Design an enzyme around this catalytic site. Structure first.
Site: not given
Ligand SMILES: Cc1cc2nc3c(=O)[nH]c(=O)nc-3n(C[C@@H](O)[C@@H](O)[C@@H](O)COP(=O)(O)OP(=O)(O)OC[C@H]3O[C@@H](n4cnc5c(N)ncnc54)[C@H](O)[C@@H]3O)c2cc1C
Ligand SMILES: Cc1cc2nc3c(=O)[nH]c(=O)nc-3n(C[C@@H](O)[C@@H](O)[C@@H](O)COP(=O)(O)OP(=O)(O)OC[C@H]3O[C@@H](n4cnc5c(N)ncnc54)[C@H](O)[C@@H]3O)c2cc1C
Lengths: 482, 482
Positions: B37, B41-42, B193, B195, B215, B324, B332, B456
Site C-alpha cells: 500500500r 518496499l522494505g 520499558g 527495546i 513500565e 509479524d 525482521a 585475541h
Molecule cells: C606490538 C605487538 C602487537 C601485537 N598484537 C597482537 C594481537 O593483537 N593479537 C595477537 O594475537 N598477537 C599480537 N602480537 C603477537 C604477540 O603478542 C604474541 O604472539 C606473543 O605474546 C605470544 O606469547 P609468547 O608466549 O609465545 O611469548 P612472549 O610475548 O614473547 O613472552 C616471552 C616472555 O618470556 C620472557 N623470556 C624470554 N626469554 C627468557 C629467558 N631466557 N629467561 C626468562 N624469561 C625469558 C620474556 O621477558 C617475555 O616476557 C603482537 C606483538 C607485538 C610485538
Molecule cells: C522503530 C522500529 C525499529 C525496529 N528495529 C528492528 C531491528 O533492528 N531488527 C529487527 O529484526 N526488527 C526490528 N523491528 C521489527 C520490524 O522491522 C520487523 O519485525 C518487520 O519489518 C518484519 O517484516 P514484516 O514482514 O512481517 O512486515 P512489515 O514491516 O510490517 O511490512 C508490512 C507491509 O505491508 C504493507 N501492508 C500492510 N497491510 C497491507 C494491505 N492490506 N495491503 C497492502 N499492503 C499492506 C504495509 O504498508 C507494510 O509496508 C523494528 C520495528 C520498529 C517499529
C-alpha cells in the site's frame, strides 16, 4: 644449600603461552614455576604489543569517526591532544592487567622467579636472577638459582628482527618505541608492510604523522587475501605519501635534520628521503637459540624455532615448547591454546593441539580478518574451492555505519562443500571471524551457516548472507545463476 | 476487461517478510506480485524501524564516546548539532536502500502493485489502488484491481498498539514520530520499558532530552535475562529522572505548557508530571484482522495473528502467512527466514521453518543480545541448565575499550551438555550472538566452542572463554572448582 628449587613443571617465559600453560598445569594440582626475566607477566602481548597497540588503535578510530559525523551535522573541531595523558591511559590498561596476572599467580600458588633462565641439563634450569620493574628493562643481579623440573614448558617467545644496516639513533624505533608515544613524528617511514607497522602507522597518521611504507614484497598485509587488502588499501591510501612496495631500503643515514633513507625498487624516490622518524617493523625472530636448549638436549632450528609435535613435545620427551618460539603464525591466541595442551600433557592427560584453524587479524581501519583456507593458500595447494562473497554495499547496517566498502567472504571445499576459509574486511572483523571459526571447527556447510538466523540489521549477518549467496539463495542481492 | 491480473504467487506486503518471500519465489521461476500500500518496499523495518533507528543510534553512540575520550587526553567541546542534516542523513540511508529494493524487484520482474489488498475469495485479492510517495502516507485512488493467484503469501506485518486513554496531540508520538526528529524534547516520557522505546530513549537522551520511562512490568527489556539488563540499567541509569517500573500511566492530559501525565504504582510521583513530549512505545498489534482474510477462508486469531505451520501454510493450503502477522518474536530476521520457507513451498519444494533459534537484540548502549534458552525460559520450562558466564572485567579488550562492565553468558543443557542459550551485554553484542547462534544450530558442546581458537584481544573471544569456564579450564580467571 644456596639456590636450588624443585618443580613438576617450570614454564620458561610468562607470556600468553607461558602463564596460560603455567596456570593450567597449576590448575591440574601440579607444582609449577614461571621463570620470567621481567617483573610483569603477560609477555610481549600484554606489555609491548596486543593490548597497548589496540587501546591506542581504539582512541585513534574514535577521532577518525568524529571527522566523519560532521557530514551528519554532528560538529566538532580538531580535538586537543594530551599525549602525556594518552600515554598514561595505555600504561593504565596494561598495568591494570599485569597487576591482575600477578595476583592470579599468587592465588594459583605458582612461583614467579624473576631471572633469565638458561638450561643446565635436561632437568635443570640455571636462573641468573634479574632486577628491574619495567617490561624490557630488567638487569641481572649477579645472584643465580638452580631450578629442577619433572617437566619444562619452554615459552620464551620471539623478538624484533633487527635489520643489519640500520644504524642506531633515538629516531629509529621498533614497535616498543613506537608504543612509547614519545611524540607524533611529522614524517614517519615504516619499514615493512605487515600488520604490526600498518597498525602502528594508522595510529600515528590519525594523530598527525604523514607516513611512507616500504615493503619488499608485492604488497601490504602479506598473507591476507589481496581482495581484502584492496578494500583496506583503498580506504587508507590517503594516509600515506608513498606506498613503496616491491622496494629495497638501501641507505638509512641519520642527519641533524632527521633520518635520511634511500630506497631501491620502482615508484621509489631516487632522491633519498627525510623522515623525522623510522619505524622498523621488519618481522620477529623466535628465541630458541638463546636459552642454552642444547644443554637440555632440546633441538633448535637454525631459524630459531623449536619444532614440536601435536602434543607440544620437543625431541626431549619431558620438555615442551609453545607460542612464537615453536612457529608461525606468531599470535597470542595460538600461544594460549598450545599453552593448554602442553600443560595437560604435563599432568599426564594425552592432549593434541587439535584445532584445525587459527585466526589472523590486522586491527587496522577497516580490520582485515581471516581464517583457514585462503584463496592464495588454496591456489598454492591447488585445493579446489568455492568462495561466496557478500558485499557490505548491500548491507543496511554498513551503509548506515558508513562502511559499505567492506565485505564478508566464505570459502568452501568444492568437493565436500564444507567451509574451510573465511575473510572479513570491516569494523569488528576480528569480533566476527570467530563464527566462521567455529563453523570451520564444526565442519559446517553453506546450508548450515545460511539457515542460521543471524540478527538484522548487523554486520554479523553477512556471514549468513555470504552462505545464502553460496546457496544461490540471497534475496538481498541480485539473483544468482538466473 | 478493466483490472484483473493472474499470478502464481501474490505476496501481500513488501516488508522484510514479503519482499524476501517475493524475490525467493521469483527466484524459483514463479510469476509473482507484491501488493504494498505505500510506494517503498522494505516495510516498517527499512522505512520506519530497523534502519533509521540504528543509523541514529550509531551517531548518538559516537557522540557519547567522545565524551569519554577526554579522560584519555583527547579533547572536544560539545558538538554543534544540525538536526536538519541529521534527519536528512537518516532519510538518506533509508532511500538509498528503498531505491535499491525497487530496482531489485524490476530486475527480478516481480510486479509491485501499489494498493491496499483485501481478500475477495480464496484465489482473489481485491486491490484498492493507492497514491502517495511517503511510507505511511498513501491514499486510495478510488480505482481498484482484481488480482488472482495460485498461491498467496500474506506478509501484512503489525502496527503500533494505541493506548485507548491517550489523547491525540502533536506531542504524543509513537516510534514513526520519534523517528521524525522534529526536535529534541527537553523532557520525554517513554510509555513502555521495551527495546524500541529504550532504543528511542537512548538517542534522545544523548541528543539532550531527560527521559522518564514507565513500565507496567517488573522491569525493562522484558524477555531478556535480568542479569543482562542489570548491566544495561547500571550504565544508563543516569539518563533517566525516573525509571518508573511496575507503574500504571493513568492520566495523560495535554496542556498549553506540555503534556501532563499522572502515573499509578510505587516510586511513582503522586504529582502529575509534565513533559514536552511522550513516546508511546507500548507494543505492536499484528494486522491479520485487517485484510478480509475471512473471504479467503484463512482463520485469524482474536489477537490478530494468523497461526501457520512449520511450512508457513495457514489453514488454507495455498495460502501462507509470514512475519509479524504470524507471531512473536516480531523481528525482521525472523520474517526473512519464514519468508524463504513459504516462497519454496510455493515452488513445490517441501520446506520447514527448521531453525531452532531466533536472536533478539536491544541495539541500546550497551547492546543486550540473546538467543535460545534463557534462564527465565529455562526456569519456566524448569529445563535443567548449566550457565557459563565470562566477565568482560577480565577481558583485555573491554578494559581497553572501556566496556569491562559487560559479559558473555553461555547456557547449557545440563543433561546433554549441549549449548541451548547465549546472552551478551556489550558493544557489538548483536554482531557476536550469531556464533552462539550457529553453535546452538550445530548442537555444539562447551568443548566444541572452547577448543575453538577465537582471536585475541577481542570481545568476540569471550564466547570461547565462557566455554572454557564451562569446562572449568579458563586460565584468565581465578581457578574453577579448585
Ligand atoms: C606490538 C605487538 C602487537 C601485537 N598484537 C597482537 C594481537 O593483537 N593479537 C595477537 O594475537 N598477537 C599480537 N602480537 C603477537 C604477540 O603478542 C604474541 O604472539 C606473543 O605474546 C605470544 O606469547 P609468547 O608466549 O609465545 O611469548 P612472549 O610475548 O614473547 O613472552 C616471552 C616472555 O618470556 C620472557 N623470556 C624470554 N626469554 C627468557 C629467558 N631466557 N629467561 C626468562 N624469561 C625469558 C620474556 O621477558 C617475555 O616476557 C603482537 C606483538 C607485538 C610485538
Ligand atoms: C522503530 C522500529 C525499529 C525496529 N528495529 C528492528 C531491528 O533492528 N531488527 C529487527 O529484526 N526488527 C526490528 N523491528 C521489527 C520490524 O522491522 C520487523 O519485525 C518487520 O519489518 C518484519 O517484516 P514484516 O514482514 O512481517 O512486515 P512489515 O514491516 O510490517 O511490512 C508490512 C507491509 O505491508 C504493507 N501492508 C500492510 N497491510 C497491507 C494491505 N492490506 N495491503 C497492502 N499492503 C499492506 C504495509 O504498508 C507494510 O509496508 C523494528 C520495528 C520498529 C517499529
Amino acid at each position: 644449600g644456596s639456590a636450588d628449587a624443585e618443580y613438576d613443571v617450570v614454564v620458561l617465559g610468562g607470556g600468553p603461552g607461558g602463564y596460560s600453560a603455567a596456570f593450567a598445569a597449576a590448575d591440574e594440582g601440579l607444582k609449577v614455576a614461571i621463570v620470567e626475566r621481567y617483573k610483569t607477566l603477560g609477555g610481549v602481548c600484554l606489555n609491548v604489543g596486543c593490548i597497548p597497540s589496540k587501546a591506542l588503535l581504539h582512541n585513534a578510530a574514535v577521532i577518525d569517526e568524529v571527522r566523519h559525523l560532521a557530514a551528519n551535522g554532528i560538529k566538532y573541531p580538531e580535538p586537543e591532544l594530551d599525549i602525556d595523558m594518552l600515554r598514561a591511559y595505555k600504561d593504565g590498561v596494561v598495568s591494570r592487567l599485569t597487576g591482575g596476572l600477578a595476583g592470579m599467580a599468587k592465588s594459583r600458588k605458582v612461583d614467579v622467579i624473576q631471572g633469565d633462565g638458561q638450561f643446565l641439563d635436561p632437568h635443570h634450569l640455571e636462573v641468573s636472577l634479574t632486577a628491574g620493574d619495567a617490561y624490557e628493562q630488567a638487569a641481572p643481579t649477579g645472584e643465580k638459582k638452580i631450578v629442577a623440573f619433572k617437566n619444562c614448558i619452554i615459552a620464551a617467545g620471539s623478538r624484533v628482527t633487527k635489520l643489519p644496516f640500520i644504524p642506531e639513533d633515538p629516531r629509529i624505533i621498533d614497535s616498543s618505541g613506537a608504543l612509547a608515544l614519545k611524540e607524533v613524528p611529522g614524517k614517519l617511514l615504516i619499514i615493512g608492510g605487515g600488520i604490526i607497522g600498518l597498525e602502528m602507522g594508522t595510529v600515528y597518521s590519525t594523530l598527525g604523522s604523514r607516513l611512507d611504507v616500504v615493503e619488499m614484497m608485492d604488497g601490504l598485509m602479506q598473507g591476507a587475501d589481496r581482495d581484502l587488502v584492496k578494500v583496506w588499501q583503498k580506504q587508507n591510501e590517503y594516509r600515506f605519501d608513498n606506498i613503496m612496495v616491491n622496494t629495497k631500503t638501501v641507505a638509512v643515514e641519520p642527519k641533524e635534520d632527521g633520518v635520511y633513507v634511500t630506497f631501491e625498487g620502482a615508484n621509489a624516490p631516487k632522491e633519498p628521503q627525510r623522515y623525522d622518524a623510522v619505524l622498523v617493523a621488519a618481522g620477529r625472530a623466535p628465541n630458541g637459540k638463546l636459552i642454552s636448549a642444547e644443554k637440555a638436549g632440546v633441538a633448535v632450528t637454525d631459524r630459531g624455532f623449536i619444532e614440536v609435535d601435536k602434543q607440544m613435545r620437543t625431541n626431549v620427551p619431558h620438555i615442551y615448547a609453545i607460542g612464537d618460539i615453536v612457529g608461525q603464525p606468531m599470535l597470542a591466541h595460538k600461544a594460549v591454546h598450545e599453552g593448554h595442551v602442553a600443560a595437560e600433557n604435563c599432568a599426564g592427560h594425552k592432549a593434541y593441539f587439535d584445532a584445525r584453524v587459527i585466526p589472523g587479524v590486522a586491527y587496522t581501519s577497516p580490520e582485515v580478518a581471516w581464517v583457514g583456507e585462503t584463496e592464495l593458500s588454496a591456489k598454492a595447494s591447488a585445493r579446489k574451492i568455492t568462495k561466496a562473497n557478500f558485499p557490505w554495499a548491500a548491507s543496511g547496517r554498513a551503509i548506515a555505519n558508513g562502511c559499505d566498502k567492506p565485505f564478508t567472504k566464505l570459502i568452501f571445499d568444492a568437493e565436500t562443500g564444507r567451509i574451510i576459509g573465511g575473510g572479513i574486511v570491516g569494523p569488528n572483523g576480528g569480533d566476527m571471524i570467530g563464527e566462521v571459526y567455529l563453523a570451520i571447527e564444526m565442519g559446517c556447510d553453506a546450508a548450515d551457516i545460511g539457515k542460521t538466523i543471524h540478527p538484522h540489521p548487523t554486520l554479523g549477518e553477512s556471514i549468513g548472507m555470504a552462505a545464502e549467496v553460496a546457496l544461490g539463495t540471497c534475496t538481498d542481492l541480485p539473483p544468482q545463476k538466473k
